[PDB]
Amino acid sequence: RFLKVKNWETDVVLTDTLHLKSTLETGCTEHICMGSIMLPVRTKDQLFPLAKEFLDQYYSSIKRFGSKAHMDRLEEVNKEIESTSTYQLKDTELIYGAKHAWRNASRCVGRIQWSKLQVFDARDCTTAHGMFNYICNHVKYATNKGNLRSAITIFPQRTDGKHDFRVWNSQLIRYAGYKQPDGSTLGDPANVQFTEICIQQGWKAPRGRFDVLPLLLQANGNDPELFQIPPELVLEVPIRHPKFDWFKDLGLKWYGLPAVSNMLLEIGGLEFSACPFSGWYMGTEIGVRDYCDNSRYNILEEVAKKMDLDMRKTSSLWKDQALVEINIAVLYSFQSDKVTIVDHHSATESFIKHMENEYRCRGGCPADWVWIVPPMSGSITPVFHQEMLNYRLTPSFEYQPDPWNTHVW
Amino acid sequence: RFLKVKNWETDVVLTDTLHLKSTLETGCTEHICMGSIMLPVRTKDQLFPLAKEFLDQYYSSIKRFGSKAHMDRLEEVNKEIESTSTYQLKDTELIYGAKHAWRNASRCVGRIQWSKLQVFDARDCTTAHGMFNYICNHVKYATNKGNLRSAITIFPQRTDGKHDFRVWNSQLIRYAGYKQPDGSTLGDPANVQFTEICIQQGWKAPRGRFDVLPLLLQANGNDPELFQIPPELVLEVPIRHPKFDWFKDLGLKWYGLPAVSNMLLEIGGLEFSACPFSGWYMGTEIGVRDYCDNSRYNILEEVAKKMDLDMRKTSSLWKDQALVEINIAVLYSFQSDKVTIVDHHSATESFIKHMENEYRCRGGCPADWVWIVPPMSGSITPVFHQEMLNYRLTPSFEYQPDPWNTHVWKG
Numbered sequence A: 001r002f003l004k005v006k007n008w009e010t011d012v013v014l015t016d017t018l019h020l021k022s023t024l025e026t027g028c029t030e031h032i033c034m035g036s037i038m039l040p041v042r043t044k045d046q047l048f049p050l051a052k053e054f055l056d057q058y059y060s061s062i063k064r065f066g067s068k069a070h071m072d073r074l075e076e077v078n079k080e081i082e083s084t085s086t087y088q089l090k091d092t093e094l095i096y097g098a099k100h101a102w103r104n105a106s107r108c109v110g111r112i113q114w115s116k117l118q119v120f121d122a123r124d125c126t127t128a129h130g131m132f133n134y135i136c137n138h139v140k141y142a143t144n145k146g147n148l149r150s151a152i153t154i155f156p157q158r159t160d161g162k163h164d165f166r167v168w169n170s171q172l173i174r175y176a177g178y179k180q181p182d183g184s185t186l187g188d189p190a191n192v193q194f195t196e197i198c199i200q201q202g203w204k205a206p207r208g209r210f211d212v213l214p215l216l217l218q219a220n221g222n223d224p225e226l227f228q229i230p231p232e233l234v235l236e237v238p239i240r241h242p243k244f245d246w247f248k249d250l251g252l253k254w255y256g257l258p259a260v261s262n263m264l265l266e267i268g269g270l271e272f273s274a275c276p277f278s279g280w281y282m283g284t285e286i287g288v289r290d291y292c293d294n295s296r297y298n299i300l301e302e303v304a305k306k307m308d309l310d311m312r313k314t315s316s317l318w319k320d321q322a323l324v325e326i327n328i329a330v331l332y333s334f335q336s337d338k339v340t341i342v343d344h345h346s347a348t349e350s351f352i353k354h355m356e357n358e359y360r361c362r363g364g365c366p367a368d369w370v371w372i373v374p375p376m377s378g379s380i381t382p383v384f385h386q387e388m389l390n391y392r393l394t395p396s397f398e399y400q401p402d403p404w405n406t407h408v409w
Numbered sequence B: 001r002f003l004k005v006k007n008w009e010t011d012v013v014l015t016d017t018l019h020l021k022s023t024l025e026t027g028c029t030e031h032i033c034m035g036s037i038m039l040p041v042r043t044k045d046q047l048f049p050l051a052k053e054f055l056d057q058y059y060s061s062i063k064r065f066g067s068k069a070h071m072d073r074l075e076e077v078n079k080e081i082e083s084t085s086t087y088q089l090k091d092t093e094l095i096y097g098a099k100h101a102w103r104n105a106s107r108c109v110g111r112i113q114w115s116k117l118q119v120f121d122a123r124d125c126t127t128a129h130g131m132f133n134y135i136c137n138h139v140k141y142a143t144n145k146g147n148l149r150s151a152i153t154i155f156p157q158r159t160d161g162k163h164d165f166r167v168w169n170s171q172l173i174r175y176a177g178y179k180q181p182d183g184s185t186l187g188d189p190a191n192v193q194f195t196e197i198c199i200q201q202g203w204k205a206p207r208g209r210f211d212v213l214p215l216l217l218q219a220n221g222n223d224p225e226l227f228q229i230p231p232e233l234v235l236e237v238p239i240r241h242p243k244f245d246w247f248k249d250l251g252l253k254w255y256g257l258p259a260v261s262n263m264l265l266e267i268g269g270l271e272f273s274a275c276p277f278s279g280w281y282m283g284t285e286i287g288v289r290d291y292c293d294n295s296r297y298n299i300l301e302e303v304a305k306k307m308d309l310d311m312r313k314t315s316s317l318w319k320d321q322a323l324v325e326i327n328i329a330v331l332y333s334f335q336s337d338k339v340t341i342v343d344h345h346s347a348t349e350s351f352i353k354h355m356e357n358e359y360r361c362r363g364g365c366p367a368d369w370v371w372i373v374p375p376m377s378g379s380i381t382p383v384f385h386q387e388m389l390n391y392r393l394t395p396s397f398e399y400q401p402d403p404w405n406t407h408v409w410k411g
């Protein structure tokens, strides 16, 4: 029942009890571990236990468990579900829920920040044009001229499931990808399908390497509509290197605001299918993954060549040398332009401190080692040596299928 | 039942059926994943099914399933178990067994090599002196003057658990570690406890930074005995860098032969508690872990100092820069001395080819992503982007507790 996690660098052992409150399934069994697999409406009957579980945790959090106000709210919610088949969260409950969804996000190294989250309540939104306005305001608030602030914007909850709010984009800001008659890909190869959907819905594509995609927004189950984020709201950073003058001539840039827009926020059994959220980048996300994944911008070869490395043999570690220089350039460029960024050393150090806090104050911290360990220099970061238990707590952020598969036009 | 794994770089999808032959537990449940946890005498009744399962696998592999020879061997083993409470493996079965334990080792990136393993049968060994001789011979054979050859030496199986053979060393070759009164460590901090045991047992320690430890060998449940591996059998590589001439003056060296000696080999329900095995290094084992872990030789700072890197902020990535140069030096040094080593790019690329082959010919390849992904440059290797399924097949290598915790001292 009570489980130990050990840090093999420091010998510090922590005891996890929080996992006993986990509700959802992992995909693992006693026979098979699926730890490395990326992807392993509610009736009145389903909804009340979920609402109760959540309200209990909420009332406990404000030291009012078993109080009249606790029992009265439980009563009110029960009545509302029985009569309307759903219920509405109080603003206080919504903020608490969103913050805890982040707190519970086992794949997030940045959770030391979880209690400093600005929540924008967009449950009064009714149209796609309304969605666009809310998202611009989120973008400007979160960006804050480069001094980034964590934020989430929460659109109306699912009802019968035929009137879902969805942001079709995977992030609020991403670059277009285009199939060339040449056979190669211009721009971000990850976004080729979404770009085609944008063009088919009417977008006039510039056909460049870093074209910011328009938003495709769906309100109340309606067909999604296209909106362009005001260009002056999209803060970008040209990538240069502190030592290599030639680096700037690769013509690289990235955007300052990482903002996930395709996940589902579950609070007290209620499902918020459009809940874009944003923080700030850890540098490896851009320098290792976006730039160096073979299926992304794939720039290692070009950089290695400009460095005049021996590329004849893998054992020269030319890929590794170039990787580090690309990541140095990313961090330097963001820091020089005064756009918030965190390096993987600093972020993982903070996560260990957060884990210790959470064990001390909460009895555990669900964490997915496969995602928490950075994609370069794993074992020189403290999280590599830290055992982690992965389990699913609610409120939560969940992956959901791309809507173009789901949508009936 | 079919399980699919996807590669997120190539979109290649593979289908696992082999997991249906797993029976032992992972530590995970539908409610918790223990994928990053390092550590998540049989009766007659439990032994015959295990023997039968193994013999069935062995006879299928030689395309003699259900033959008279297969049926006769089942009968013969059944009679041996009922009469002696255990049984002895044929030489052929032992070899098949050891190769398959390697094939099944989900944490091993080197498994493309599994079918090429020299098995030394040391089941006739009776004393620690005898174990010492077998181990010297293994070291010389495996080392092969730098052209490393994979090998395993298998000592007698467990009987009542009161007569175990054990190599107390965690690897056949490792460097001593000495905790100083001021709380600093000389040599390898990983080996301080074991070094203290050796000294207590009578080892005269040179007290330097790279002192090869003596073997501490337990035969037939007796108290262990100390032996020094002949120095001329211990191949070492001084570490230097192809461009940085100051790298040699760090005074680093490492041994060429990585040889795990503390694991338990299970074949057909039998337990081989002493089964040292050796392959060759992947460079990152030395350059990342042994040299750069904070709790090991911990050389990052000194290297970065000598490179004149900006060390005032972690965001200069000075650690990452120094790490790559150290790993270049290890590969360069082994290659220049003609000692077998493989880089992490080569090794992971070969592993992916091995895994895809196994999926086609065997229906699966259990793999532990947490261990298979190298400890530097993870996402620029193809294994980072490969989904894996981790499950336990037998024959297998298992961790066992250090013998000093459990040993009954006779005196």
Ligand code: HEM
Pocket: A098, A102, A105, A107, A108, A109, A110, A111, A113, A117, A150, A151, A152, A277, A278, A279, A280, A281, A282, A285, A342, A347, A371, A397
């Ligand atoms: C404040 C700075 C933050 C940092 C430095 C940070 C760091 C990260 C990183 C590096 C990842 C892995 C990304 C990937 O590999 O795709 C991640 C994942 C994630 N984070 Fe954060 N995070 C931050 C803020 C937030 C916020 C504000 C939320 C929600 C309110 C959040 C929720 C999540 C979730 C749900 C995932 C998993 C995403 C997925 O499955 O694709 N994070 N975090």
Ligand code: HEM
Pocket: B098, B102, B105, B107, B108, B109, B110, B111, B113, B117, B150, B151, B152, B260, B263, B277, B278, B279, B280, B281, B282, B285, B342, B347, B371, B397
């Ligand atoms: C031929 C060259 C080989 C290479 C390059 C190789 C590579 C590796 C590496 C890098 C690891 C993880 C090491 C660590 O982090 O401590 C490992 C683990 C392991 N390998 Fe191999 N391997 C090889 C041969 C062998 C052989 C001959 C066997 C047994 C017959 C074997 C069985 C294992 C096992 C059981 C583990 C997990 C060990 C543990 O739990 O501590 N490998 N391999």
Ligand SMILES: C[C@@H]1CC(N)=N[C@H](C[C@@H]2CNC[C@@H]2OCCNCC(F)(F)c2ccccc2)C1
Pocket: A038, A039, A110, A171, A258, A259, A260, A277, A278, A279, A280, A281, A282, A285, A399
């Ligand atoms: C199939 C996968 C299932 C899943 N849950 N998720 C993925 C998204 C992938 C993961 N890896 C790259 C890409 O994720 C794209 C978004 N990256 C995270 C972020 F950059 F937006 C970010 C950074 C810092 C704070 C907040 C947000 C798809």
Ligand SMILES: C[C@@H]1CC(N)=N[C@H](C[C@@H]2CNC[C@@H]2OCCNCC(F)(F)c2ccccc2)C1
Pocket: B038, B039, B171, B258, B259, B260, B277, B278, B279, B280, B281, B282, B285, B399
């Ligand atoms: C608590 C742990 C449980 C476990 N299963 N194992 C560990 C040994 C650790 C793993 N990581 C560092 C150290 O293992 C050190 C030995 N590494 C393997 C080897 F170098 F000896 C080797 C490499 C290639 C072929 C043959 C041999 C203790």
Ligand SMILES: C[C@H](O)[C@H](O)[C@H]1CNc2nc(N)[nH]c(=O)c2N1
Pocket: A035, A036, A037, A038, A370, A371, A372, B008, B384, B385, B386, B387, B388
């Ligand atoms: C197959 C494997 O699960 C996959 O490549 C994962 C590994 N770890 C990751 N870690 C993070 N933070 N982000 C990712 O996209 C991935 N990808």
Ligand SMILES: C[C@H](O)[C@H](O)[C@H]1CNc2nc(N)[nH]c(=O)c2N1
Pocket: A008, A384, A385, A386, A387, A388, B035, B036, B037, B038, B370, B371, B372
């Ligand atoms: C806590 C975590 O499981 C532990 O540090 C693991 C991570 N991955 C590893 N991978 C390898 N190959 N060897 C190791 O010792 C470890 N250590």
Ligand SMILES: [Zn+2]
Pocket: A028, A032, A033, A034, A035, B028, B029, B032, B033, B034, B035
């Ligand atoms: Zn698992």
